[PDB]
Design a binder for these strands. Structure first.
Ligand code: K
Ligand code: K
Ligand code: K
Ligand code: K
Ligand code: MG
Ligand code: MG
Ligand code: MG
Ligand code: MG
Ligand code: MG
Ligand code: MG
Ligand code: MG
Ligand code: MG
Ligand code: MG
Lengths: 27, 131, 81, 122, 118, 200
RNA sequence: UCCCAUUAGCUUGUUGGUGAGGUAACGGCUCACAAGGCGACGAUGGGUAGGGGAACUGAGAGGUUUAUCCCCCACACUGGUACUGAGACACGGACCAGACUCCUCGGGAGGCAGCAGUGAGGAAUAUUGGUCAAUGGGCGAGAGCCUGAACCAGCCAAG
RNA sequence: UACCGUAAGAAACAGCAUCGGCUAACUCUGCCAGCAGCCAUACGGAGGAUGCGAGCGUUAUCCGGAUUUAUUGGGUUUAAAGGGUGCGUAGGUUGUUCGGUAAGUCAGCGGUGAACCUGAGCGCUCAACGUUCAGCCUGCCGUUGAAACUGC
RNA sequence: GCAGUAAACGAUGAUUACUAGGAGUUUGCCAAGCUUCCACAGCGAAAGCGUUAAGUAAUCCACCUGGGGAG
RNA sequence: CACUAGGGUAAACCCGGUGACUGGGGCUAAGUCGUAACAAGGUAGCCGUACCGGAAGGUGCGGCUGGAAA
């Protein structure tokens, strides 16, 4: 219950989802 | 129920910790032998066997030191559990509390303590440690 | 004054062979590390000249010379059916 | 775990890793200096450390710290590389053995001579 | 063939031999069928320890001893035909009495005087 | 190897004149160096154990590997570890010669043993670390019974008062009765500290 | 008697039988009906490794490695085939096919995992030494001959 | 083994701010460094002192403390760690009592299991070492019994 | 009809037996079967849990072995 | 005439390498743009999912307290 622990995971999820949304529609 | 002997030990331990004077257990032959061994070695004050319509009831009266308000029994430990059975020979019989405790053991000559097991040179299943 | 060939007691597990049967011998012993007593089985291949065994019968087998490729036992007696 | 769980699966042990893997368990190695350069330490330390990029005989690139006061190392110099990492310097986990092959001993040394390859003064 | 021989087992400059029964093709200090004694040639009495019954049994079944092993066996008295006698019995050789022959030969001791009167 | 350095330095560092009697120990009771006799900084218990071990080693002329092996022998042996260690130290041939009084100092006894002026059971033994057993006879070699240094050392040593040593001046020899008790051994070494240092 | 299930099906002489042949010998070992055999108690496949006693280490449980020493196995440039022999992966035997290398114009030789030089590789490891005096081995009726096994000497901060 | 005449032919290496055994002067980024960190009780030299000693330091590798794979001998609310929840196959465990059996278990007897390693000697002037003998065989196999417990 | 995820949480797997007191509360007759808060022993690094245990014990399953890289 | 080492052929598999070009990640400094989180961090925070933005992020829907204030 610090908060930074969840902030790091939130950052990683943001980056991964941005990568996937950029890669969609391109083949 | 998975281990009646461990349950009997747990009932005794919980009664001692709570400070009760009498504890009632469902009866069994091996449990009766263990109660007899405990009375002979002087860990319990008294015992009584009651034969009702069920398997029976063992009623055990515990022993308290009036000088120090301390029970005669300090630790009861189950050794050979159903998930891991333990058998020893007479040469490798355990010694409990450096000989100041007892190890109830079932041998082909009957249920006895590690001292007479070593004397008669018979091994078997280490039921429990008492001290 | 013989040399007492090995003998085993097992349970027939198959008889769908010409004069050959499969005998499964099971036993218990403690684990080398954790000490728990575990079950293991061992299968055999025995010769039955008279084809006098079914399935699940308790049999006694004796060690012989090689009678085939992986067939080294013969059926001595039948203990149960 | 339960005894049955340990019987089914068991325990797993993982072997450690070498602190200086490019030596390949050899105590020392021979190498050739690619670039002999100067570097800056971490935040609480200020200096100009002398490092060399060394190509070992086993075709590995290492950063080796040159110890002592002054050195004669240049490019295409055959040197001996041993283990040992400097704390403030990041990525430098090897040392140059002074007084062996091309690199010479530290001049003017009197104490700790054997650590810098300095002969006993006459 | 089966042989009776010695395996060198001491150290450099001090040889100690183990009298064994071994197949002739075996390595000198390697495999052996049986061990029947030991031999220390460094001591002037030439120390010998031997298992008489086993040595006699191996000679009987036909192990061939080497030269030194045969000499050791003869010294210990294994090489005899007293059992070979088909026309006599209880033929006590008693040659151990003569084989005792205790050689208690010693050396006289002399000393140098210290004339340091100064 | 041997220490073969100055002795008054060690005597002053340890206070006790372990190398006998000297005129330097008076008017100088400080450890050597320019930082001597400047009070006494608090030395740790480990430092005290180390200084006791060094005192024993400099007293008996034994280096560290031999001392460690002697401790291992005492540990293997039956009895008190420290008492056994001191008995083993005193049972060395040079120490036995020194206690018999053939030589003035332990180093003199070691030099005589090395130069082969000492016989054990009638035979020349020249190993200074030789462990003397009770019942053995240690005497001057017959070719060196008229050495001036030996004669001077024995002059005035008519006491020969050590209970565990029987001296015969007619044969110029001596015998060891038994292993003396630690309280009978006249050494100020606290073997307990060495024992805990070597066992911890 | 090691890891991988990010390897789940494998097997057609394969499992059994009848007979014959073959071998020192039993046997699908080979050759001319039935459909069985092995498999989550891990078959099959892939990767890695010679295996033990020692040794080291730890109170023990255990762990690491098999340098020197002993036992068993495998091999002799790479494959194939046998012959001789009581005995053969034939370590100072043969034939054939490969590749490599050497010396010669028709061709012929070698195999350094036996002991010593040397070179290369490497952080790094020695004499092209003496003797069969001892122990062992082969042959010989024995004396004896041979023995880089062995016993010794030389070199090496060297435990 | 013995005789000539000779101290004569034979000491270095690493530490010294705490942990850690050892101290002050002169220099000054150069550096040091296992950690705390230090640009001087820590850098370089000088004087001293402290370890060890024909060695002393550095690197590499392995083991122990390390219980950091925990059978002996660890955990999972919040430190890493309960499957989203059930049903259920294999597997694991099985109330009480009587009688058999003898697979597990217990006991007796027998066989089997160089060198090294453990007490006692003996020989290496001692010691390493070599060797002998007593104490280990505490695994495996065979064969006789016991029946409390588990299994059938 | 797919999809199969959540701070899908009591951040607490399922069974069995045992071991103090108070204060409320739902249901069929003092008493079960529940559902909520203080709190003995005991447990825990502490916050705290405490008969609905995170206490005392037995059986089976799941999972963990420094952080990042990296689900 | 079978048997076979070796040779050629084709495939397909496995193990490796390199390649115009094109993507993340780690580490070091700090140039540039903002201020997302830590206080009710100035719109409570976080989980899942969807869409959208130079970036931290924003918004919708459901959930949680590991949130004040009340
Ligand atoms: K022949
Ligand atoms: K010879
Ligand atoms: K039962
Ligand atoms: K919910
Ligand atoms: Mg985002
Ligand atoms: Mg032939
Ligand atoms: Mg030495
Ligand atoms: Mg967590
Ligand atoms: Mg849940
Ligand atoms: Mg979760
Ligand atoms: Mg903000
Ligand atoms: Mg905000
Ligand atoms: Mg919008």
């Amino acid at each position: 219950p610090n908060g930074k622990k969840r902030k790091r995971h939130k950052m990683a999820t943001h980056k991964r989802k941005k990568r996937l949304k950029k890669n969609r529609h391109k083949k | 129920m998975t281990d009646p002997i461990a349950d009997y030990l747990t009932r005794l331990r919980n009664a001692i910790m709570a400070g009760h004077r009498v504890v009632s257990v469902p009866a069994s032959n091996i449990k009766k032998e263990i109660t007899k061994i405990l009375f002979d070695k002087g860990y319990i004050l008294n015992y009584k066997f009651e034969e009702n319509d069920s398997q029976g009831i063992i009623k055990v009266a515990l022993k308290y030191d009036l000088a120090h308000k301390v029970n005669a029994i300090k630790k009861l430990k189950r050794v050979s559990r159903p998930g891991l059975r333990k058998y020893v020979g007479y040469r490798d019989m355990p010694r409990v509390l450096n000989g100041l405790g007892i190890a109830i053991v079932s041998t082909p000559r009957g249920v006895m303590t590690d001292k007479e097991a070593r004397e008669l040179k018979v091994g078997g299943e280490v039921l429990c440690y008492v001290y | 004054e013989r040399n007492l060939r090995k003998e085993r007691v097992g349970v027939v597990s198959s008889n769908k062979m010409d004069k050959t049967i499969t005998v499964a011998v099971k036993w218990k012993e403690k684990h080398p590390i954790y000490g728990k007593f575990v079950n293991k089985t061992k299968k055999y291949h025995a010769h039955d000249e008279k084809n006098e065994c079914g399935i699940g019968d308790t049999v006694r087998i004796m060690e012989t010379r090689p009678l085939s490729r992986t067939k080294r036992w013969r059926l001595t007696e039948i203990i149960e059916r | 775990p339960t005894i049955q769980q340990l019987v089914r699966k068991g325990r797993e042990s993982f072997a450690d890793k070498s602190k200086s893997p490019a030596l390949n368990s050899c105590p020392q190695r021979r190498g050739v200096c690619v670039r002999v350069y100067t570097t800056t330490p971490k935040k609480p330390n200020s200096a100009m450390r002398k490092v060399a990029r060394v190509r070992l005989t086993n075709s590995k690139e290492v950063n080796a710290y040159i110890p002592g006061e002054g050195h004669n190392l240049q490019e295409h110099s055959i040197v001996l590389v041993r283990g040992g990492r400097v704390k403030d310097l990041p990525g430098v986990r090897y040392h140059i053995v002074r007084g062996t092959l091309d690199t010479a001993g530290v001049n003017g040394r009197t104490q700790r001579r054997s650590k810098y390859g300095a002969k006993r003064p006459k | 063939a089966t042989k009776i021989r010695l395996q060198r087992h001491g150290r450099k400059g001090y040889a100690f031999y183990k009298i064994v029964v071994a197949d002739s093709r075996a390595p000198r200090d390697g495999k052996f069928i049986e061990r029947i004694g030991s031999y220390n040639p460094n001591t002037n009495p030439a120390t010998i320890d031997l298992n008489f019954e086993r040595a006699l049994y191996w000679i009987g079944v036909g192990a061939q001893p080497t030269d030194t092993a045969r000499n050791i066996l003869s010294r210990e008295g294994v090489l005899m035909m007293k059992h070979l006698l088909g026309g006599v019995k209880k033929g006590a050789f008693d040659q151990a009495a003569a084989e005792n022959k205790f050689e208690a030969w010693l050396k006289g001791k002399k000393d140098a005087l210290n004339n340091m009167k100064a | 190897a041997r220490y073969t350095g100055p002795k008054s330095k060690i005597a002053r560092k340890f206070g006790d004149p372990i190398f006998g009697a000297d005129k330097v120990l008076s008017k100088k009771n400080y450890p050597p160096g320019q930082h001597g006799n400047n009070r006494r900084r608090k030395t740790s218990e480990y430092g005290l154990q180390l200084r006791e071990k060094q005192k024993a080693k400099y007293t008996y002329g034994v280096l560290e590997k031999q001392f460690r092996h002697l401790f291992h022998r005492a540990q293997r042996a039956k009895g008190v570890t420290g008492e056994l260690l001191i008995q083993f130290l005193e049972a060395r041939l040079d120490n036995v010669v020194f206690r018999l009084g053939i030589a003035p100092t332990r180093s003199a006894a070691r030099q005589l043993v090395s130069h082969r002026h000492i016989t054990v059971d009638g035979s020349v033994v020249n190993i200074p670390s030789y462990s003397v057993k009770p019942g053995q006879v240690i005497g001057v070699r017959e070719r060196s019974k008229s050495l001036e240094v030996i004669a001077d050392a024995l002059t005035g040593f008519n006491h020969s008062k050590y209970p565990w040593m029987e001296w015969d001046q007619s044969s110029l020899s001596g015998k060891l009765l038994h292993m003396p008790d630690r309280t009978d051994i006249p050494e100020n070494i606290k073997e307990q500290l060495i024992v805990e240092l070597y066992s911890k």
